């Protein structure tokens, strides 16, 4: 299945997992500080994720950061 | 499965998706605040995404950025 | 590449884009209406085996780019 | 499955879907008008797609123009 | 399932799909004025198609173009 | 690439296409005429595994072009 | 499946085709004369081919001619 | 690629390589700690479904490297 | 299902089927004169193929031509 | 099926195998001298992989060589 | 790419090709003597797992080419 | 399946077939003499291969030689 990498740019970023099914709520906040960085797929439970502070993203897509 | 990168140039942008069958409705709306980033997919319940507001926006097909660069990828 | 979808950018308001039912009949079952950039990222489905893009739009699929409209 | 993607370039373009099986008839005519976009697939009663009038087409196997 | 592209250069191109099985005929006749485009599907009940008249035509092996460019592609 | 074909286009009059049958016996089933400038695609199928060009003709296949015949 | 173009470049060239399974001999023999051109696959029946004369041949490993 | 993995090399000691939980609940299952030079690659698995570097670290999955962390 | 083009570079070059199973042996020997071609597959009875005599041989691994080119591709 | 190319660059080099499943612990350390290689598979027992040492390693990913070079590929 | 092959191109009399048993045991169960420019094209298959060859000999397989031996 | 091409650059290099499941333990060690060839797949048995001696080395990962 895909997957995001995300890198905290900032202490704070929070990367936020959205329900997949007919409701969508958050299950999931993960906080990272600086510099730290999370490889995070799309599953059965997740089919979007949010990502709140400053980061620099990898996806298949390609980059964006800030 | 497909996804779409959004990530918002603006405060209070609106992903909104759209019901996947017969009938067309939004079911959800995520708002997202200036600099803050949606990666959504396509999924069982939702067959159509709509942005409202200045977006920078990556899917499959290309790059669609708000006021700026449009291209084919 | 087990799907596909189309991108709809208005370049003015008023832009509709409009699903056409699959099957053996052809009838539009939904107009999206999007005001200038406002973008719609839109599959072929189940329910919708052909789009109609009226009024100025940028729009690419896997074939490429169709733009100034 | 494969689609089609046509812009009229004048009024009163149609797009004409003709019956997929053993019988090929006319079961649809779009008209669109100059500067309108048909994004079109191959289907389960579509085998063939005919476009009357001033168009840009295209295709898996390019673009067709005029 | 392959698919060709034909743009007729002259009234009264043909385009004629014979039919899969033992047997070859003609099932159809699909008649294109000067400036109309065909795009049509081997399928169930067309294993081979004709084009009788000047044409652009386009497939996955390249174009043919009657009185000029003939491509691999 | 689940299924292939051939493009022939006649370079003269009475170019034939020809189709060899499917199995273990092999024979001419079908002989298809082609005037000058005429274009056949046609499949390998369930009943066609060969197929036969007499007179000249442009090819094209998923293996390249053989033309001026 | 796999096909093998062959033209051939003088008179009375044979393709031939010899027998899928444990036992192998030549099953049919189709005659070309100069120019003519036969398009063929490997089948259940034909699981080797050989060309007898003066022939361009094309597979999906290129081209052999003379 | 039915698939995936990740690459982690420590830039530094005491970095750690963390397992998130797959399913509906998401916490920390397991974490690894790298010394500087240390080199860790680790699936995506039926148990784990994100993975957290902290630390600094050269990083290497499909979509690229992150680096100098 | 890979195959193999052979073409002979003097007479008599072999071409020569071993049997796919626990037990090797050659069970058929196909003869070449100059300048004839075999195209042959690899199949239910035949898993490996040995070439006997000056020949010019295409695989999807590349090209060896007795006395003269060896290329990779 | 993925796998990872391991050269121990000094005596001693540990590549060690982690428990696919809910439990995370190693099963397996295989010890490689300098200049030894090891071609290891993920597997339906191994998930993760350690390497502890000065090594050239080898995946899918790209290189990754101790004191060295480190490249997308 | 459901199936590979390797090619084995004798430079010198006497080479052999040796297909090693698949499975649990490791055992040679054929040897098969090349002279000087005769050419081997083998399969892995399912009593074949290992390939040595002896001698000198120019290889070809999926992974490129070693020569000169 | 994925194979490995090793070539001997000294005499006695060793070949090692370490074995799938559980267990891993030494299931066959081949020698090879300079400039012998072994080219072994990964199977039911072997999951991880280990080569002692100076040798060129061919995955799908690319060379190393030494
Ligand atoms: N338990 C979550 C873990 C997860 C994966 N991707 C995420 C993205 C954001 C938050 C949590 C996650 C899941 O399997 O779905
Ligand atoms: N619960 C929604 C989450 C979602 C995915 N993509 C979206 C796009 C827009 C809005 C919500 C979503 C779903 O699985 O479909
Ligand atoms: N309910 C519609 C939503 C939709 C998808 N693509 C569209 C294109 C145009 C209009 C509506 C749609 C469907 O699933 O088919
Ligand atoms: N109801 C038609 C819609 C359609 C798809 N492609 C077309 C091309 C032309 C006309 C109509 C169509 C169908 O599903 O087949
Ligand atoms: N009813 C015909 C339509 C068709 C498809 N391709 C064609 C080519 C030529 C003529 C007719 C056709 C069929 O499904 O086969
Ligand atoms: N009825 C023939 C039509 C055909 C397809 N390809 C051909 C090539 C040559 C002659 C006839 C054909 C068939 O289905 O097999
Ligand atoms: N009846 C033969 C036709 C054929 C295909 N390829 C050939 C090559 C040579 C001779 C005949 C053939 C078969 O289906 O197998
Ligand atoms: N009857 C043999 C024909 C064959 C195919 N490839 C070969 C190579 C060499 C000799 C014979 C063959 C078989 O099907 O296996
Ligand atoms: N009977 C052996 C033939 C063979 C194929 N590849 C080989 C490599 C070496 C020696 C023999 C072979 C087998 O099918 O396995
Ligand atoms: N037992 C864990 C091992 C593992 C794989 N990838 C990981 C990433 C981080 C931590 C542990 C792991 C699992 O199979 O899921
Ligand atoms: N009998 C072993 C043969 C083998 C394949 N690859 C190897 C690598 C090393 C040692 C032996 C092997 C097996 O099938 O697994
Ligand atoms: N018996 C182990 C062998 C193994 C494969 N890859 C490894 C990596 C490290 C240590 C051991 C291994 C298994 O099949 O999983």
């Given at each position: 299945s895909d997957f995001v990498v995300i890198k905290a740019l900032e202490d704070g970023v929070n990367v936020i997992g959205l329900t997949r099914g007919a409701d969508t709520r958050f299950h999931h906040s993960e906080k990272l500080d600086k510099g730290?960085?999370?490889?995070?797929?799309?599953?059965?439970?997740?089919?979007?994720?949010?990502?709140?502070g400053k980061a620099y993203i990898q996806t298949r897509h390609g980059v964006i950061e800030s």
């Amino acid at each position: 299945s895909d997957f995001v990498v995300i890198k905290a740019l900032e202490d704070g970023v929070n990367v936020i997992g959205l329900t997949r099914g007919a409701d969508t709520r958050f299950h999931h906040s993960e906080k990272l500080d600086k510099g730290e960085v999370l490889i995070a797929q799309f599953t059965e439970h997740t089919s979007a994720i949010k990502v709140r502070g400053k980061a620099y993203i990898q996806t298949r897509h390609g980059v964006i950061e800030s």
